[PDB]
Amino acid sequence: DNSQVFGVARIFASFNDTFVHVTDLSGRETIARVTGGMKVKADRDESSPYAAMLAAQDVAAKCKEVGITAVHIKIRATGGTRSKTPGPGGQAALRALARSGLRIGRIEDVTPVPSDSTRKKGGRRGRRL
Amino acid sequence: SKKSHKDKAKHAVVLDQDKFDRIMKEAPTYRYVSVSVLVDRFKLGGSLARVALRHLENEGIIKPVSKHSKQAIYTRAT
Amino acid sequence: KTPVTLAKVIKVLGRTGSRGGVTQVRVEFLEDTTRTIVRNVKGPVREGDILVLMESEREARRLR
Amino acid sequence: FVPVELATTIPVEIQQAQQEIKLFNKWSFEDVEVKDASLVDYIQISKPIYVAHTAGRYANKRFRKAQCPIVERLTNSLMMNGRNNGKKLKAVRIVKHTLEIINVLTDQNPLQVVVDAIINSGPREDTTRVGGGGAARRQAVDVSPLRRVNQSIALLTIGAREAAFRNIKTIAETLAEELINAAKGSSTSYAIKKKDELERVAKSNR
Amino acid sequence: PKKRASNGRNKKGRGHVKPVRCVNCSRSVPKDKAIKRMAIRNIVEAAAIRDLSEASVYAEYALPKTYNKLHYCISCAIHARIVRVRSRTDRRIRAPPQRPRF
Amino acid sequence: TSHCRFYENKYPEIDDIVMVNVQQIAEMGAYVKLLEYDNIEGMILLSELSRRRIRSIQKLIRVGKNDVAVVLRVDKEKGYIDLSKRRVSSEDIIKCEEKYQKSKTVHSILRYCAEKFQIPLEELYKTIAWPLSRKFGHAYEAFKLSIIDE
RNA sequence: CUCUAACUAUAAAAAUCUCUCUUCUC
Ligand SMILES: [Mg+2]
Ligand SMILES: [Mg+2]
Ligand SMILES: [Mg+2]
Ligand SMILES: [Mg+2]
Ligand SMILES: [Zn+2]
Numbered sequence: 126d127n128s129q130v131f132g133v134a135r136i137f138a139s140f141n142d143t144f145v146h147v148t149d150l151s152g153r154e155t156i157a158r159v160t161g162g163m164k165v166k167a168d169r170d171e172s173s174p175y176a177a178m179l180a181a182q183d184v185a186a187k188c189k190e191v192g193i194t195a196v197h198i199k200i201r202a203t204g205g206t207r208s209k210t211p212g213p214g215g216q217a218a219l220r221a222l223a224r225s226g227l228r229i230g231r232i233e234d235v236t237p238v239p240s241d242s243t244r245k246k247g248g249r250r251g252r253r254l
Numbered sequence: 255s256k257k258s259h260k261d262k263a264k265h266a267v268v269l270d271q272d273k274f275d276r277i278m279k280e281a282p283t284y285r286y287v288s289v290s291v292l293v294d295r296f297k298l299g300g301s302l303a304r305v306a307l308r309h310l311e312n313e314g315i316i317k318p319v320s321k322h323s324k325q326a327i328y329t330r331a332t
Numbered sequence: 333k334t335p336v337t338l339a340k341v342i343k344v345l346g347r348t349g350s351r352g353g354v355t356q357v358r359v360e361f362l363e364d365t366t367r368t369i370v371r372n373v374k375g376p377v378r379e380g381d382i383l384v385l386m387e388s389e390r391e392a393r394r395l396r
Numbered sequence: 397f398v399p400v401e402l403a404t405t406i407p408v409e410i411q412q413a414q415q416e417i418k419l420f421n422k423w424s425f426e427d428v429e430v431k432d433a434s435l436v437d438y439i440q441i442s443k444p445i446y447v448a449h450t451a452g453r454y455a456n457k458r459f460r461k462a463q464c465p466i467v468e469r470l471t472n473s474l475m476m477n478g479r480n481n482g483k484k485l486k487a488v489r490i491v492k493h494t495l496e497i498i499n500v501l502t503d504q505n506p507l508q509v510v511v512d513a514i515i516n517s518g519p520r521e522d523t524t525r526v527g528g529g530g531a532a533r534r535q536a537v538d539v540s541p542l543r544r545v546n547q548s549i550a551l552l553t554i555g556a557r558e559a560a561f562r563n564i565k566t567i568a569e570t571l572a573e574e575l576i577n578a579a580k581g582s583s584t585s586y587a588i589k590k591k592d593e594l595e596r597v598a599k600s601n602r
Numbered sequence: 603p604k605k606r607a608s609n610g611r612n613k614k615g616r617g618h619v620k621p622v623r624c625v626n627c628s629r630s631v632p633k634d635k636a637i638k639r640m641a642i643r644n645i646v647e648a649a650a651i652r653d654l655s656e657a658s659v660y661a662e663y664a665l666p667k668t669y670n671k672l673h674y675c676i677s678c679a680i681h682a683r684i685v686r687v688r689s690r691t692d693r694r695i696r697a698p699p700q701r702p703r704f
Numbered sequence: 705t706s707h708c709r710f711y712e713n714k715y716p717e718i719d720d721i722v723m724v725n726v727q728q729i730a731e732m733g734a735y736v737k738l739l740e741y742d743n744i745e746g747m748i749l750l751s752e753l754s755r756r757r758i759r760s761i762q763k764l765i766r767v768g769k770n771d772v773a774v775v776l777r778v779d780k781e782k783g784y785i786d787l788s789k790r791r792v793s794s795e796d797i798i799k800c801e802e803k804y805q806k807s808k809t810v811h812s813i814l815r816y817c818a819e820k821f822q823i824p825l826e827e828l829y830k831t832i833a834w835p836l837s838r839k840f841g842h843a844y845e846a847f848k849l850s851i852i853d854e
Numbered sequence: 855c856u857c858u859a860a861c862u863a864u865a866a867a868a869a870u871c872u873c874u875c876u877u878c879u880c
Contacts, residue, residue: 129659166600166776167751167790169533175602178389195659200645208625209670210641213863217391220650223657224389230659232645234668241622251629251675254865286500290565300564320496325566327493329500338433354524354537367652374522375540378459384434384520385538391649395526395535396864530866532758533751583782593747596784597732600749643861667860681865703860757866 129195129228132156132188135235136200138215140208142171145180145218147188147196157187161214174217181221188227195228204237206245211236267299269306277306281315287328338362339369340382348372349395356392359383417444419467419507420492423499428507432515438541439511440465448488462542466511467491469545473553474571490568497572504579513578517551517587518544521598536602548587552578555586606693611635624675626682631675637685638673706815708826709742710807712834716741716775716785721796723804724748724773724787726765738785739770740807746775746785753789772800810843 133152137144137160144160161176164183170176188196198219202211211234223229266273276297284291289307293300307326310316320327339359347355349372356372362382372392373383397413405411410421418424425444430436440463448467454460474480474487498506522543523534539547556571563570577585583592608614612634621630622638644667646654655663679685716722716738723740734748754764777786792800814833818825836846 127659166788167533169531174393175390209672210625211668216647216650219646220653221389223650223654228659229654229657232666234645234666236668245623245628247623247628249630251624251627251677254627286497288497288566288569290569293564319500320493322489322493325493325568327496327500349524349526350528351525370649372537373540374524374537375543375546376458377540377542381437381541382434383538383541384432386521390536391647392536393863395524396528528864528866530864532866592782596747596786597749600747600786641861642859648861682863701859 130193131195131197131230132193133197133199134219134222134229136198136215136218138177138200138212138218139172139203140210140212143177143180143212143214143218145177145184147184147193150197156191156193157184159183159187161218172212172214174214177212177214177216177218178221181218182225185222185225185227193227195230196222198222198229198232199235200233202236205239206243209236209238265293265296265299267301269298269302273297277309281310282330285329287316287330289326334386335388337385337388338382339371339385340365341377341379342368343379344377345370354395356394361388417446419445419447420495423495423505423507425507428505428511431512434520434541435515435518435544438462438545439514441507441511448491449484459542466514466545469549470510470552473549474556474567476557490571493568494572494575497569498575501572501576509579510575513552513575513585513587514545514548516548516581517578517585517591518548519591519594519598520544521595523594523598523601534597534601536598547591551587551590555590558586622673624678625672626678627675629675629677631673635676636673637676637679638671639684641670641672643668705818705825706811707743708829710811710829710833711741712837714742714744715780715783716744716778718775718778720775721800721803722773722775722787723770723800723807725770726767729765729767734765734789738773738787740773740803744783744785746787748773748787748789751790752776752787755790770804772797806842806844810847813847 131150132147133150135146135148135152137146142160142162144158144162146155146158146160148155159180161173161178161180162171164179165171165173165176188194200211200215200219202209219229219232276295280295287310289300289303292298292307293303298306307328310328311318314331316328317331318326318328339361341357341359343358345356345358354372354374355377356370357377357379358368358370360366360368369388370391371383371385372395377383398411399408400411402411414421416424416426425441428441430439430441443465445465445467448465448471450465450468452464454464454468471484471487471491474490475484480487495506495510498504498509518539520539522537522539524537525532526535527533552571552574555574556567559565559574560567560570565573574585574587578587581588583589611632613619613632616634619633622633622636623629624631624636644651644665646665651665655665674684680687720741722738724734724736724738724746726734727736729735732747733750733753735745736748737743737745750758758764772789772792773787774789774791775785775787776791779785810833814825814828817823818828833843836843840846840849
């Protein structure tokens with residue numbers, strides 16, 4: 126084999142402040158919670174594709190530091206109450222992972238899907254912007 | 255008017271034996287020569303900067319490259 | 333930190349931006365020409381021109 | 397060398413051996429080498445031109461502009477407003493003495509120095525105002541090579557003018573000083589200063 | 603008068619329908635007057651499909667596809683240009699706009 | 705003569721909080737001087753400036769007076785500052801004016817001394833202010849203790 | 855009288871108005 130030290134990407138992407146969070150395959154001991162929100166300035170870009178790329182580069186450096194070589198992608202959208210759709214920058218995130226040395230495998234979308242339960246904060250007529 | 259710049263004399267206009275000493279000394283050592291450049295070291299008002307420039311080309315002190323009106327350029331005689 | 337890169341543009345991909353003063357094109361790195369990136373640039377160009385870029389990781393979107 | 401008989405004789409120096417084109421009869425385009433790859437083919441030094449004045453139809457087409465010799469562009473930039481537009485001879489003389497100064501300082505046949513200043517001073521990155529009203533903010537963008545050389549020229553001339561403005565150090569001197577500082581990487585040049593400032597602000601609104 | 607034969611509802615003999623909620627404006631909306639879509643798409647943007655493929659173990663991959671049934675209100679949908687205002691003689695054509703790409 | 709930055713070194717550190725007086729605006733914002741750290745110039749982009757809507761630019765810029773400042777990025781190789789007026793809160797403003805007064809008083813006393821002696825004020829900070837700021841953490845508190853303790 | 859596939863993302867504020875109203879026949 127290639128003796129790859131498998132990790133998990135566990136991408137957390139939303140309409141605001143996408144997250145990057147690598148850990149063990151189970152998800153026991155977390156590595157580098159640092160998100161894209163830890164690297165951008167004006168709050169324009171908490172969920173920017175560039176914020177995702179910066180977070181991905183930092184966590185790739187961290188993974189090389191620790192020894193993780195293969196990583197498993199678990200992207201996420203909030204689901205439940207909010208839009209069921211991935212954060213905009215998360216795609217760049219994964220791409221920034223791919224270009225940055227680390228091997229990848231077993232991409233998954235753990236974006237929750239509910240059975241039409243509870244309610245979405247909003248009111249009857251909906252968001253009245 | 256309010257001259258907030260506060261420009262001092264910024265140069266002297268009447269030449270002297272000692273600034274003559276400097277002119278004769280650092281006529282070389284300045285591989286670029288032009289009226290503004292020679293003025294810029296406190297030593298000449300500028301009206302007689304041309305006069306000193308004429309004084310320079312007397313005994314093979316500095317060689318010319320350009321001597322145009324409003325703008326003349328020398329380099330130290332090698 | 334200057335991993336400077338150079339990319340020859342192959343095609344003009346119209347023009348973006350609300351002003352219409354910035355045009356997006358498809359530029360391929362001279363190093364390993366097999367890959368390309370879509371990038372938006374301010375100022376007239378044509379294919380055959382080469383552009384120096386600091387960054388080599390931006391696929392900028394349709395600017396509005 | 398190559399002595400030629402005439403009845404209406406022309407000076408010997410311009411009659412010597414000069415199938416060896418020099419701009420001001422003394423500055424060849426030979427061995428003036430193009431540095432930047434993204435800026436090659438956007439500098440016209442290729443054609444050996446005889447003086448920094450040519451009444452060419454150099455604005456009719458979209459991209460015939462790149463066929464204009466770099467010296468001509470620098471001169472035309474040197475023309476300032478209505479007053480310097482109507483006075484091309486003055487600008488040509490000023491740029492001639494500018495190359496003279498460049499030749500005086502650290503030799504380095506001046507044309508290479510000026511083209512190196514050109515390539516150094518060009519901001520490859522810029523900020524575009526994209527946000528509509530509410531989030532009125534600039535965003536990152538890169539810069540066309542023609543746009544590169546254009547702002548390089550513009551920063552050079554604006555620095556020369558601002559430094560020269562109501563200042564004893566004459567415009568030819570200011571321009572040559574800026575060109576020397578820009579052929580190197582010293583922030584003393586106003587042109588390179590603005591180049592780095594735009595690079596920084598672009599690096600902010602990335 | 604009457605804007606539409608179906609009153610823009612498409613209930614026509616159901617008495618009532620359990621409401622759904624818009625993805626964007628998030629309004630209670632009758633499930634039939636609830637213009638909605640299958641935003642089918644591959645998990646990755648079409649641009650990087652190359653790079654990721656050689657950035658991964660397990661060659662000859664499948665590249666999964668993420669799905670979503672998005673419920674759009676009337677207002678948000680007409681706002682985001684995903685539904686186009688039409689002439690009445692043009693409105694009635696219920697046929698989908700003929701397979702966007704081919 | 706005012707020189708010899710109140711704190712230790714020339715270049716501000718990372719995420720250090722300072723105070724800037726507006727000096728000149730071209731289009732991008734307040735590329736101005738600092739009055740707490742070194743007087744080195746630093747950019748202030750307009751989006752890094754306003755919490756409210758940008759209605760009155762001229763009423764807001766207020767040239768000739770100090771204002772809060774947070775440093776985000778520093779040029780430590782040629783000399784420039786990325787500085788902002790958006791990453792501040794009121795309780796942060798409190799310590800901002802505290803530090804403003806703390807630096808102003810020491811600058812006043814040592815400027816008086818350097819003016820009276822004609823001794824280069826950088827030598828004053830070298831010989832006096834910096835050892836006191838090393839012993840006691842700040843030269844102002846050291847002067848206060850000097851009043852009681854010789 | 856033989857075809858069933860691709861795809862994206864703005865919503866910043868705008869408040870108001872007292873006028874004259876006029877006529878068609880071989
Ligand atoms: Mg509304
Ligand atoms: Mg109606
Ligand atoms: Mg309907
Ligand atoms: Mg109204
Ligand atoms: Zn809606």
